[PDB]
Subunit: 338 residues, 6 copies
């Protein structure tokens, strides 16, 4: 009974797999190799010649995990060396040395899948499928704004799927029950008028109450949220950002970024407050079952954001099965409520 | 190769899900909500307006577990409140308040399955399916006999199916091997004459040896045993009762009740002795594999009780698939050996 | 995508299930019963009348595990007694006493499968299927050579399949990467000429470098290796032997034997060195995925041994499905490279 | 720097060592033997001929712990049997059988200290020293009041000394900081007029605010509190009682009893609420150091109860060192504030 | 048999108690309060009005730990609030509010010891005793050098005393045995000429071999090391700094800082390499017993640094017992070898 | 209140510190070094030039534990190398190389205590003090008897002192209570006539009942027992031997040897039976308190062996304090009962 039966669409989006700090801590070299799991796939990350690559975590020779091998160099070029019989892979996933027969000549069969991989906002992003060429790395505002300061949090795992995490983050009606002593609900028992737009691959909506502020959401699909809070009294802004990464069928790894105006307060005060909130949501959201969004779930008027999110996920899931042009239309066609 | 392929029949019987004490200890309120699993189904128990209800542990809105919510009251009526967005359910499983849009009007889709649920012998019983209206809560003797005193034991889990637990409880031929230093076998190497009757939904049989006593069994199907021990010298009686609850495909939760004549002895002496016996049976019974009763198992003459138990289970399993009248006939038709 | 889809062939070979010491330590009696798992089957070992038998670990009466029962004797004959209702089994798996009705007469249905089982080199070997009568217990050299001394190591589990363990043991090209500070590679970047023969159920090959020695392999199929190391300077020999037992679809239990010329050195020095090597291989080999050999794996010239191993495994797997004569031909037909 | 340097006085009071239920659960017999520690002394409890005795947990023969032996009977008399060589002790601590030389005659040296021991309010009380004959078992009200119902809680350990636990229980000024979301402070920033009397071995005081109620304390020395709460609106009463047992120099074992008017509410609701309060106090009180009351601690006006408690403890500590008449005067002399 | 019997001298030096990051992570507020132990004393750290204070972790009222209370504010001034009855302390350790009697007037007895406390190099330093006014916060070079970048490592505990940690850090003769595969020894079997000076409270010495570099040590007493490594080929410098904090009689908490020229390498590569070295030293140094430096230890010529360190520690230990002028002379008198 | 206040005497006896197998397993080399504790002293064992030495586990340079260093060789001579700065010790405890200044000349201060150490019965024995030259390695019979076979068990720790272990091993009156279902008592309620002799450093006594056998004890002081069991029917003998090693003030390490006539039974059957007995004694003996033998313990007639054991221990303890001749007289003077 799940809404989103086919997951092929998710392969065409950029997903975060770890923070840059997490990547550099994964191996004593500071350059990997490191193992991550994305959409059920086991990937290896390694920094070769100052660029982080993402490849299949599976040597073509005898299937050892490259993520427990080592980054090594020859003639000023870096390679990912297998831990087992030492085959070396370059940034494109081509095996450039078989040490057992080094003269050579290396079969084209000796090659692993190499994937789109870029560092942005001090997070490592991977896109498994290039074919449809219409997705970009999720939007975050003010990372480079010199009036503000950034916290890139360590990532955290929830035992639910990424859709449940996104719908939790964009919902206010649960504050009275999940967050009663922690978060004030500025809309309780209200039905604010909220227009939901699709603009350039993003869900965009704005919430205003009837200290008070506005809530402006830019949400790169399928799993990101950029929440701009603008205070009414004064023009001070606060950005809370999260993206859920679809690790596998039962978990997601979540990346939080806090952007705030410079203040001489300890960063840990802001991180610990968000952790306190996260720890209130976590057991409620992990109790939701089945994990996958189900068609039988009952939506009411205040679930407009969630309904629009589910609608676009379903359409994207179907469009990707249809082919390149269907998908690109679904991603790129703007839809302004009116 | 299992004897009892279809489990639909089990839904029509009353099964114990927890003791009353267990239910009251599950939540600081003393009124739940509490989670239990019955026949693979996740249920929530809560005490609303002095009655314990059993419902599906799954909110209709976004599938959160109601069993981690709270019992709350409005205008003197109790409700089961979801932990996530606060929908309130009444004793019938109808949602009576959506706090996001409270004026209202609540869709009929906003409703969870509510099940038969009654407290008897300080145990909580649930029946998942009403349709065939021919089963009752298992028989226990002397709970209200003012000459005797009762112990309702905490329940315990065995990693086997409920049929294996029942056949273990009604068998004497294993005493010499499982219980040699603990229980005397009054029938060893004997073949006592035992008549097995079906009477009003119960297996009934009596065992007599050739301090000594008689063993009178009334066994409400599918998983209860009421064992009356009447001593020969004197007319003193002792009741040992158990029911196995079919939690899921690999475990059962077992409920023991001891009824004895008042004696000024500590209850713990009787409980600890039964635990000692249980701990001798447990690893032998949990070693039985496959867990499910298999058709290839070899029965001999002394397995008459077990064979009659398996026969009636198989007939009940088939009758329930056939329909209401077939099932009611199988449950209700008495069969006296002769 | 696995190379070896059908596993029926493995049933026709002798596999080690435990060392003799392991068997004697499994039960306070020193005679079992003991539980082992072979090819996914649960077996019971017990020593009855001075011979270790192997049978199905499943009583025919009510399916209790015989491996938690006891070896008992009646009239000078030993029996395997079930822990539950005491049925006694003889060395052939026939039930010889039902204590509930002992006079008697025991049904032929009351019988468990009994398997080939022999102790050799202080290891317990089992063969599940007799039908094709063409396999023998793997070859080990010098167990009885009075100039040498033997270590039969405790067995160890790796979380991989037995083929991966065998290919690891017969490969030198991984030394530079897995064993750099522990084992010298006598062939690095060389392509020694290696002839691989099939002789009397064994893969046989010899490796010579261009202290130095020769490496002479006799490898009883499907999973044994007898490695004779003969030093060039002097004629001193050292035997390293291993057999991988196919426990189940995700693990193998490995048996090592070291045979060396008598030396007044502590055996633990030799065992600990081999453990150090094993601990270097273990995480690399356990990283290989999928566990099962896959057809897509890329073999190069230096994998000749592994390729010949995979070839004969595939042929054996197909021959066994074809029937007795096909299998016997595959096992017994010698093939000398030329 | 501790206030109460000498602890001899504590030996002359009755202290609770376990609940009756705890005693009956300690051994499968329901009659002990059981081990407890009181004032650093290791004691054995056993029920012999329907009376629980307390003795030194140390056999006179070779110093084995009697608390791991067994209660046994001979000629209708119960004995405490040593686990080692079987010496039997009667209720007075006299050895009545040496099984190695049973004819006999038992030395008077073969004898263990036996102590005052009585069950009251379903709690086991022990008094180590009889000599001064002026102390009684602490006061609890309404245990036998048929309009009310009693909960005797399982005991709990805090890692502090018993004086700290008592002063915590009789203090309201910590509610705003330790219990802000749990307990309302009816006296915050007030200085109610409180008269503290010494009456018949008890500290007695009453607190009234300026639902509301009165707080009437009768506090048997050295470590008990009986708190009667009488509501203003209506005459309904609620009794909260606790006694701290001085286990050793770093811990106390605490006994709580709740007495309330009959109400058809689950007992667990009242127990769980008190546990919630206890869990707020526990880490704050366990942080107090040094554990022992120190002379340098700074008392203010609102510590009147604590100051009077410390005064009488110090006087009792000195009186006991002085002798029988000094102690009896300190215990028994009433002192009414005026 | 210990060299340094009297520890009073250590109270007069600045010791690091935690990194700034560690302090800010200790409490969700980012401002403490936090608990640390220095020279056996329990201290509380809290940030009040933008300055971190250090005080005795013991409320004057009833001895609760202030480190589990909270930083609170009144009328724009911050206070350290006790968790128990809410007494508030200012930066000088004076109690400024007793909430039970707030009008007021607070006794001078209501006061806790307040200690010297300053943040330098992103580390929190405490000096317990001011009296002799001749010590300063240890020397570290290049923290503010804009051509270089700094790593302030998390602190780590070793189960040894701080003298053993210092002597380990300033010694090269152990490299061949503790660090054979990790650190090259530039002086092995050499006796370089090393002059050891006392200059302004520092041990100063320089080591030169006969890539290569010079080793210039400035070592603020009693437990700091600033190691400047200047490469011969090129003038590039690398600073490795450590200070051992005397936590108690059996452990020290160690603070490492790495200063290096900017390089676009990941900081984790440098941290992980130092951890690898630390993990080689740790079990050897923790094996040294007795922990305290003993007079019987045998020094050879290559222990010149250690001998001079022990000499000055012994003299400082004696001078502090003698009085202010003796100590100030020992700390401040320069001694140039010649 | 302990009987044996002074422990100096124990230093003059040979004590077992580990089995030979235990020593060879302690380090991958098979030659140590290994750490043991004897009479509170930390010792290092290492095999140098085919002989195991015992020395103080404390390097003279900077007090590192030699037991975590390594056995190394130079010019065909073995040395114990310190893990810290590499000082090498020979079999006499003299430092023969300081690698920092190797030319040399090594101070006589650079030397560790070296102790008597010999392997006998595949056990490592150490004697800390030579001075009185009158003790030998405990007696065990039949180790070299070619009609019998030996089991040298792994050693085991009990949390009691060695005297309690010895008295437990030589006592039959506890069988009925500690071993009721495991060991038959051949003397229950009997007072067999037992003569206790002191012969050549041994307690010697023989016990005969009124399958049956004689029990002949030769007990080398202070802690060994050689029990010869000779069956009446037939002349078959069975030797059970144990020695308790005084590890420290709260524990002993116990060495068991079983010698039996050759029988084709598994050794594990005999070991497991003795472990079953040991596990019955262990919690009773560990309950004995105070651990040290106390003067107040009450001995009866059947404790004759224990009383004679305590007498000779007390005399030995006093004699050793008196001097060489007193001790030698106490050890060597035979005393035949008559
Ligand atoms: S598995 Fe990677 S080189 Fe062989
Ligand atoms: S999931 Fe229950 S109210 Fe939303
Ligand atoms: S120690 Fe109690 S009978 Fe011997
Ligand atoms: S202990 Fe700190 S306010 Fe009372
Ligand atoms: S401590 Fe042993 S060589 Fe320095």
């Amino acid at each position: 009974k799940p809404l989103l039966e086919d997951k092929t669409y998710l392969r065409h989006f950029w997903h975060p797999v770890c923070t840059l700090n997490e990547f550099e801590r994964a191996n004593a070299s500071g350059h990997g190799p490191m193992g991550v799991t994305l959409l059920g796939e086991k990937l290896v990350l390694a920094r070769l010649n100052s660029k982080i690559i993402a490849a299949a975590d599976r040597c073509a020779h005898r299937s050892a995990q490259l993520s427990i091998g080592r980054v090594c160099s020859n003639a000023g070029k870096d390679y990912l060396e297998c831990p087992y019989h030492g085959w070396r892979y370059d940034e494109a996933g081509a095996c450039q040395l078989i040490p057992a027969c080094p003269d050579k000549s290396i079969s084209p069969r000796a090659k692993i899948s190499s994937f789109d991989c870029e560092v942005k906002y001090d997070i490592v992003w991977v896109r498994l499928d290039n074919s449809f060429d219409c997705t970009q790395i999720p939007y975050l505002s003010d990372f480079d704004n010199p009036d503000m300061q950034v916290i890139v949090a360590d990532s955290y795992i929830w035992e639910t799927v990424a859709e449940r995490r996104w719908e939790n983050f964009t919902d206010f009606s649960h504050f009275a029950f999940v967050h009663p002593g922690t978060l004030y609900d500025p809309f309780f028992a209200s039905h604010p008028t909220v227009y939901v737009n699709r603009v350039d691959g993003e869900l965009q909506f704005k919430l205003a109450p009837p200290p008070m502020g506005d809530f402006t959401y830019r949400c790169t699909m399928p799993y990101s949220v950029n929440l701009e809070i603008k205070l009414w009294k004064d023009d001070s802004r606060f950005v809370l950002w999260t993206t859920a990464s679809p690790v596998d069928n039962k978990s997601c790894r979540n990346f939080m970024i806090i952007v705030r105006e410079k203040d001489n307060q300890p960063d840990h005060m802001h991180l610990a407050f968000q952790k306190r909130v996260l720890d209130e949501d976590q057991p409620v959201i992990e109790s939701q079952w089945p994990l996958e969004i189900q068609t039988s779930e009952v939506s009411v008027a205040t679930d407009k954001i969630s309904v629009q999110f589910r609608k676009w996920h379903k359409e994207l899931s179907l469009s990707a099965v249809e082919g390149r042009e269907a998908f690109r239309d679904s991603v790129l066609t703007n839809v302004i409520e009116e």
